[PDB]
Amino acid sequence: PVDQPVHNYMVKRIHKRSLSAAFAIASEALSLLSNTYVAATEIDSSLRI
Amino acid sequence: PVDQPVHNYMVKRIHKRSLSAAFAIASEALSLLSNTYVAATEIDSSLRI
């Protein structure tokens, strides 16, 4: 009668990372971009696509 | 904010080759070829083939 069980209690930290990137849009790109949000019979489909 | 993409634009030259060969026809050969253009009951089939 000398044996007893033992339990371990370790805990782990969560830590913290992130991921970032850049993305550029031109003035002509935003200009022809804005009309495709209201795409209709106007705003030419070839340049839009 | 120092990351920007870059695109590469290389173009290829089409170049130009050809291939040539010789091929001879005898006088008897072409003279018999002329009669086979009007192949009929005349111009014998064994010599024609």
UniProtKB/TrEMBL annotation, chains A, B:
<protein>
    <submittedName>
        <fullName>Major capsid protein</fullName>
    </submittedName>
</protein>
